Design a binder for this molecule. Sequence first.
Ligand SMILES: NC(=S)Nc1ccc(OC(F)(F)F)cc1
Ligand SMILES: NC(=S)Nc1ccc(OC(F)(F)F)cc1
Ligand SMILES: NC(=S)Nc1ccc(OC(F)(F)F)cc1
Ligand SMILES: NC(=S)Nc1ccc(OC(F)(F)F)cc1
Ligand SMILES: NC(=S)Nc1ccc(OC(F)(F)F)cc1
Ligand SMILES: NC(=S)Nc1ccc(OC(F)(F)F)cc1
Ligand SMILES: [Zn+2]
Ligand SMILES: [Zn+2]
Ligand SMILES: [Zn+2]
Ligand SMILES: [Zn+2]
Lengths: 360, 360
Amino acid sequence: MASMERFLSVYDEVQAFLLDQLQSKYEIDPNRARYLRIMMDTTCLGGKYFRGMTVVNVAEGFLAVTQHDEATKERILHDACVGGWMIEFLQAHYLVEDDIMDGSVMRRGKPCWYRFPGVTTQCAINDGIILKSWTQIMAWHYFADRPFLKDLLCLFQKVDYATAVGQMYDVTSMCDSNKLDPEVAQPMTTDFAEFTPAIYKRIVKYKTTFYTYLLPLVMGLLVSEAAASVEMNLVERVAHLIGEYFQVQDDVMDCFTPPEQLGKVGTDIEDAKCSWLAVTFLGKANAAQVAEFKANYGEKDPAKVAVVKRLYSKANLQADFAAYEAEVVREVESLIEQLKVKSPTFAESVAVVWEKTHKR
Amino acid sequence: MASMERFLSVYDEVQAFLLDQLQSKYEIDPNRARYLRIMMDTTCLGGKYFRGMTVVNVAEGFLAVTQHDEATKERILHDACVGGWMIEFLQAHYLVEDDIMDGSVMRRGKPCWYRFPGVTTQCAINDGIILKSWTQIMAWHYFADRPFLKDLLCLFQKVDYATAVGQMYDVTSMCDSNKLDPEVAQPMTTDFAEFTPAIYKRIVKYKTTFYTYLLPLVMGLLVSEAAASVEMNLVERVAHLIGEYFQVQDDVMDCFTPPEQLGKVGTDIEDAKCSWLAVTFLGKANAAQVAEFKANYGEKDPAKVAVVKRLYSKANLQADFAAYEAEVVREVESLIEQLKVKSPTFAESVAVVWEKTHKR
Ligand SMILES: NC(=S)Nc1ccc(OC(F)(F)F)cc1
Ligand SMILES: NC(=S)Nc1ccc(OC(F)(F)F)cc1
Ligand SMILES: NC(=S)Nc1ccc(OC(F)(F)F)cc1
Ligand SMILES: NC(=S)Nc1ccc(OC(F)(F)F)cc1
Ligand SMILES: NC(=S)Nc1ccc(OC(F)(F)F)cc1
Ligand SMILES: NC(=S)Nc1ccc(OC(F)(F)F)cc1
Ligand SMILES: [Zn+2]
Ligand SMILES: [Zn+2]
Ligand SMILES: [Zn+2]
Ligand SMILES: [Zn+2]
């Protein structure tokens, strides 16, 4: 069976399971079950399923080199799929809540969940809670007797937490740290002293890399009972690097990809985000250019946005991006090499992960 | 050591642990750690700690009848405290998110977290995520080697989920089920056909009773390794009953307790909540009274609110409340009796839980 069709089939299985359990154990009625089915579909489906399919890919790699009964191959693949959906539903929780936080309008060329007419923020915050709660519901159902259950739950737990810490780093990235204070409305930074590569790295590492790259990789290892074919510190380092690169591309697209292609109208500039463009700009601009940036960034006025975009366009950020990209290639290739010492197979799964990121 | 002082001391311990781990493992800076400490204090402290102290109380009951080394008594008490804080932090997660959902203004005579000037909804939704994530962080730290870890996590998991399902039942309780639909903005019910005792019961059971009464009781059992001194179905039934009663009182207070005493301005009538008052009213009103109710309920206009309040005041709902209360006494006393067959001690803990609810 092709991997994607397996993975989509398991979605239907997991859906049915969750909704049947709501009827048998949680006294749900058919209309609320329908609302939840629609919510689940709308918020979990329609992306590329990169994250969830990485779990399946890493497990397939191990199957090709490990002796097992057919029923065991099927069970490992089923578990990789359930695990992959846990990550997809975790992502869905965070997109639902982040869209509400940020006042976002669209996602993937469709309205954000909370904007649907019969949803509203009042419901959608709770729908996002439910999303994450289903990850747990899946795990304990499907993995109840499995030897990797504790390590999977503890891993998932840590990644969830890291992610919520990363959101905190993201939404606060335009304020001066020394002024953070629940009692005082937060001004935007005027110095931009905190728009540094290391601060940017920290945001990205926590907000994106743990759930996008670390968790799918390590979940493939866990459902394959293969965590001893790797040096876990290498897996972390390679996840953090590739995840960085992913986010750099996302930041560039926010500013420069046409909205019809991007699936939304990018607002990083108006939102005063600590983006790769802003940090890279401030790391090379002259005094006059920095002063123009400060007078225009983080403002809704389209004239001011156009000025920041112009400043980026003239600062030859393509050169910095090339150089960055070239360095990420060296470093990711070096980690891949390292990973071969203990597992050629795992090393190749990582190379696929890198190719899919590096080309897209 | 007195139980409450133990429990508060453990809060400081758990706080320090969480914030120290954020600095050593999650690259936090001192200002964001300060924001989080303030958030944790503001959102977890200042209530009566009924829920968390029930875990400690049930464990103390078992200590008085079970032989143990002193170090074991201390360890069980410490675990009961950590468990009690898990429940307090779970509650805090749900109050933070529910206040945002509902557009609530105050809680316990102070502004809702999201209304603090330097918080905002953008941060507070994520702060509430963090709250719940800390429950997990605590459990796996403090309970990593404990024989009750899986049963505690699985229980907690189910209660969290039940709670989020209950919110869904609550926020949708004023719409007609057959019209629920993410594509269509939801009208308020005009028939009130769904304002029945059984539908009300379902809301309350899921929204409140599992986290307020079931979880603290069963968590005391689990940290005491005493789940075999009870018949779990009795524990559930008694939790659901007492929890019902708690909520009935809360609904009555929303309408009739002065706001200075209540800690907030109650808006159940304007919000068109399925409250005990509305269901009890509609179960005894005549045609004219039902028609007046329909023309005035669920509207912000204070004249209309006053009309519904007047309708409640003339419908002699005190008589229904007395009768309800008398029946809850019979039934709770009967469950308590049952619980004595296997554990007098547990039975008494339940009697305390009932007294504290029934008198407050
Ligand atoms: N299936 C879809 S796309 N439903 C939808 C329709 C309308 C809508 O309100 C808007 F966002 F456009 F204001 C949101 C969602
Ligand atoms: N500084 C770093 S790299 N801290 C970190 C590492 C691992 C971790 O657990 C995981 F999320 F990976 F499961 C959490 C935080
Ligand atoms: N000129 C450049 S390329 N400056 C830069 C380097 C690193 C960086 O953080 C990372 F992208 F690596 F996450 C951000 C900006
Ligand atoms: N400690 C407190 S009570 N701080 C606070 C002050 C002001 C405030 O804004 C308001 F809600 F009143 F609009 C909220 C909280
Ligand atoms: N109908 C009922 S009473 N359903 C139910 C019982 C138990 C349960 O697990 C728990 F939350 F208690 F852990 C969840 C739902
Ligand atoms: N007249 C009355 S007392 N009617 C009623 C009974 C039960 C009920 O649900 C519960 F309170 F039990 F949760 C609500 C209303
Ligand atoms: Zn965001
Ligand atoms: Zn972006
Ligand atoms: Zn609410
Ligand atoms: Zn209430």
